[PDB]
C-alpha cells in the first residue's frame, strides 16, 4: 500500500557493469 | 529585500538555449537516479520466498513475466570480518576523509558566492532607502478576487 503498482524501468542497454580480460586462452 | 529574495525563489528566467539546455540536464541527470532506484525495486523481487515478497516482485512488469523465486545465499560472517578487519577497510575509511574533504571544498565555494549574492541584494537595500527617502489605496488586479496580484497606492480627483 506504499503507492499502488510498482514502477517498471528494467534495463540491459544501461552504461555497463561487466569488464573483460580473461578472453585469452 | 523580501520581494527580491522571493524573486530569486520564483525559478524565473528568460533564457533561450541557456535556460532550455539546463532543464534538459535536470531531466536526464535526475532520470538516471530515478531509473537506478528501480534496480533498488528489483532487489525487491529478489526476495521471493513469501507472498508479501511476490507483492514487492510484481514491481517489475518483467517480474510479471519471469515467474521464479530465484537466488540463494550462504555464510561468510568471516567475509564480514574481512570487510571490517582488512587493512583495506582501514584504508577505505580514508576514502571517507577524502570525499568529505572535497565536499568541504565545495561547501566553502558555495558559502562565498552566497555573501556576493547578498551583495546584489544590497542594491535593493539601497532601493528601499531610496523609497524611504522622498494615498494608501490598496488594490488587487488580475481578477480572481482572492490572492492573485494585490498591492497599494494613491491617485488624483477625490
Amino acid at each position: 500500500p506504499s503507492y499502488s503498482p510498482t514502477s517498471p524501468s528494467y534495463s540491459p542497454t544501461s552504461p555497463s557493469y561487466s569488464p573483460t580480460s580473461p578472453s585469452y586462452s | 529585500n523580501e520581494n527580491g529574495e522571493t524573486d530569486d525563489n520564483i525559478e524565473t528566467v528568460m533564457t533561450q538555449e541557456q535556460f532550455v539546455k539546463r532543464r534538459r540536464d535536470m531531466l536526464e541527470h535526475i532520470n538516471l537516479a530515478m531509473n537506478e532506484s528501480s534496480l533498488a525495486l528489483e532487489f525487491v523481487s529478489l526476495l521471493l520466498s513469501s507472498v508479501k515478497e511476490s507483492t514487492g516482485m510484481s514491481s517489475m512488469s518483467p517480474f510479471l513475466r519471469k515467474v521464479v523465486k530465484p537466488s540463494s545465499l550462504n555464510s561468510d560472517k568471516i567475509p564480514y570480518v574481512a570487510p571490517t578487519k582488512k587493512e583495506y577497510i582501514e584504508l577505505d575509511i580514508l576514502n571517507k576523509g577524502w570525499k568529505l574533504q572535497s565536499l568541504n571544498e565545495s561547501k566553502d565555494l558555495l558559502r562565498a558566492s552566497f555573501n556576493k549574492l547578498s551583495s546584489i541584494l544590497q542594491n535593493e537595500h539601497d532601493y528601499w532607502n531610496k523609497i524611504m527617502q522622498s494615498v494608501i489605496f490598496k488594490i488587487r488586479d488580475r481578477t480572481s478576487g482572492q490572492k492573485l496580484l494585490a498591492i497599494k497606492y494613491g491617485y488624483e480627483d477625490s
Binding site: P12 | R24, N31, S38, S49, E53, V67, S71, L94, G97
Partner: protein, 168 residues
C-alpha cells in the same frame, strides 16, 4: 524441505526503504518530464528534500544489517527461464560503480595520502581526531552564543432609556 532457507532476514527492510527512495525519485521523475512547468520551488523542495531524506533512511537501513548482508552474498540459481533472455540476469544480479567510481578517485586523490603505509597512516588518524577535538571548541563557542530560553465607558441601553423617558 527440498531447496533451502537461504537468506534475506532484513531483506524486507532493505526493500521497504529501497522502495521509498524509488517512490520519491519516480514521482519527481514523472514531474521532471512536464518541464512545461516546474512544480513550485516549495513543492520541489518538499519532494526533493524528503526524497533525499528517503535515501538517508535507505542509506542507513543498508548498514544496520551491514554485517549480515555482505556476508550473505547470494548469487542466483533459478528456473532456466532466467537463462533465456540472458542479460536481465547479468544486469539484475550485478554490483558495480558507474562512471561514478571516477570522481571517487578524483576525491581519493584529492586527499593528502596514498602509498606510504600504516605507521604514517595511523598518525594521520590521530591528527584527524585532533581536528574533531578542535571541533569540540565549537561546543565552547556555542555556550557563548548562549541563546536558549522559553516562550466600556457606560451602559448603552440605559443611556438611551434616559433620552426617551428621562429615567436616569
Amino acid at each position: 524441505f527440498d531447496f533451502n532457507g537461504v537468506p534475506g532476514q532484513a531483506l524486507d527492510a532493505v526493500r521497504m526503504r529501497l522502495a521509498q527512495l524509488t517512490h520519491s525519485l519516480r514521482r519527481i521523475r514523472d514531474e521532471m518530464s512536464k518541464a512545461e512547468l516546474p512544480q513550485w520551488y516549495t513543492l520541489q523542495s518538499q519532494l526533493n528534500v524528503t526524497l533525499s531524506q528517503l535515501v538517508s533512511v535507505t542509506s542507513t537501513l543498508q548498514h544496520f544489517q551491514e554485517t549480515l548482508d555482505s556476508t550473505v552474498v547470494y548469487p542466483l540459481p533459478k528456473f532456466p527461464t532466467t537463462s533465456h533472455e540472458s542479460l536481465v540476469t547479468t544486469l539484475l544480479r550485478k554490483k558495480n560503480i558507474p562512471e561514478v567510481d571516477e570522481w571517487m578517485k578524483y576525491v581519493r586523490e584529492t586527499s593528502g595520502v596514498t602509498t606510504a603505509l600504516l605507521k604514517d597512516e595511523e598518525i594521520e588518524k590521530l591528527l584527524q581526531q585532533d581536528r574533531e577535538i578542535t571541533n569540540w571548541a565549537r561546543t565552547t563557542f556555542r555556550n557563548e552564543y548562549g541563546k536558549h530560553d522559553f516562550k466600556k465607558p457606560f451602559n448603552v441601553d440605559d443611556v438611551l432609556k434616559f433620552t426617551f423617558t428621562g429615567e436616569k
